Write a protein that binds this ligand. Structure first.
Ligand SMILES: [Zn+2]
Length: 258
C-alpha cells in the first residue's frame, strides 16, 4: 500500500512505486573517512539563522517537521560547496528503536542514535516545488545525534511532541532558534545525493557535519513515543524511520577538513 518503514512497505519495497530508488545518486550513503577527499577549494559554511521564523510543528506520518517562514531570506545557508542562497524551509529527524541505530548516513559503518536534517532550497528556483526538480535545488545539512548529555536547545521540541502524537496533528511553534541545534565545529563532508524519503528525487547537495551533538536518553526516548498512525487507528510507534545506506556508485565524497 502506501510507503513506510514497516515489513511490507519498507525501504526495500519503495522501488516499485518510485523507480528512482535504484538511481545513480541515491542517499544516504556510508562515509568512508579514509577514501573521502580533502578539497582545499571548499569554502567554510555560512549559516545565517539569526532572523529565522519558526511557525509550526507537524506530524507528517513518517516523522515530524518544524516549519519555517521561507517567503524571505530570513534563515539562509550559503558558502561551502554551494553556489547561491538556500532558504531553510523545515527540519526533521530520523531515529531508531534502540540507541545503536537511527541515523541514515553512517561514518565508517558507525550508526548514530539519530540524524537531524535541516532542509534548504535554492532561491533561484522561486519555490520549493520547482527546486526539487533541479540537480542543485536543495541543500540538506545533516547532523548526527549521540546519546550522552542533554541538549538544552532541543528540549522545547521534546516538550511539544505530546501535542502532535498522531499523523496530521500540528501545533503552533513560534520563536524557536535552530542555532541551538548546531555543534561547535562546522567541518563537513559533502556529496551529491537525493531525498531519503519518496519521491527520492536526486536534487540534493548533502552537507554532513563531522561533529555530532549529544542528547540525553530521556530526550530521544520521547521521540519514540510518537505514532506513525492517525488518531483512532491502530497504534504503531514511530521508530526506525531511517533508510539504509545506498551504493555510492560514481560519486566522490569531499571533506572540508584534513
Ligand atoms: Zn530526512
Amino acid at each position: 500500500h502506501h510507503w513506510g518503514y514497516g515489513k511490507h512497505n519498507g525501504p526495500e519495497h519503495w522501488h516499485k512505486d518510485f523507480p528512482i530508488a535504484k538511481g545513480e545518486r541515491q542517499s544516504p550513503v556510508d562515509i568512508d573517512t579514509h577514501t573521502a577527499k580533502y578539497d582545499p577549494s571548499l569554502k567554510p559554511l555560512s549559516v545565517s539563522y539569526d532572523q529565522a521564523t519558526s511557525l509550526r510543528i507537524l506530524n507528517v506520518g513518517h516523522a515530524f517537521n518544524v516549519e519555517f517562514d521561507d517567503s524571505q531570506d530570513k534563515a539562509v545557508l550559503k558558502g561551502g560547496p554551494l553556489d547561491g542562497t538556500y532558504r531553510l524551509i523545515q527540519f526533521h529527524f530520523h531515529w531508531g528503536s534502540l540507541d545503536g541505530q537511527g541515523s541514515e548516513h553512517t561514518v565508517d559503518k558507525k550508526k548514530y542514535a539519530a540524524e537531524l536534517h535541516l532542509v534548504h532550497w535554492n532561491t533561484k528556483y522561486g519555490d520549493f516545488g520547482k527546486a526539487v526538480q533541479q540537480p542543485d535545488g536543495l541543500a540538506v545539512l545533516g547532523i548526527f545525534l549521540k546519546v550522552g548529555s542533554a541538549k538544552p536547545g532541543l528540549q522545547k521540541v521534546v516538550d511539544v511532541l505530546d501535542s502532535i502524537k498522531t499523523k496530521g496533528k500540528s501545533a503552533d511553534f513560534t520563536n524557536f532558534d535552530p542555532r541551538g541545534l548546531l555543534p561547535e565545529s562546522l567541518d563537513y563532508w559533502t556529496y551529491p545525493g537525493s531525498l531519503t524519503t519518496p519521491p527520492l528525487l536526486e536534487c540534493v547537495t548533502w552537507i554532513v557535519l563531522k561533529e555530532p551533538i549529544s542528547v540525553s536518553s530521556e530526550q530521544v526516548l520521547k521521540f519514540r513515543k510518537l505514532n506513525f498512525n492517525g488518531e483512532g487507528e491502530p497504534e504503531e510507534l514511530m521508530v526506525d524511520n531511517w533508510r539504509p545506506a545506498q551504493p555510492l556508485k560514481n560519486r566522490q565524497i569531499k571533506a572540508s577538513f584534513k
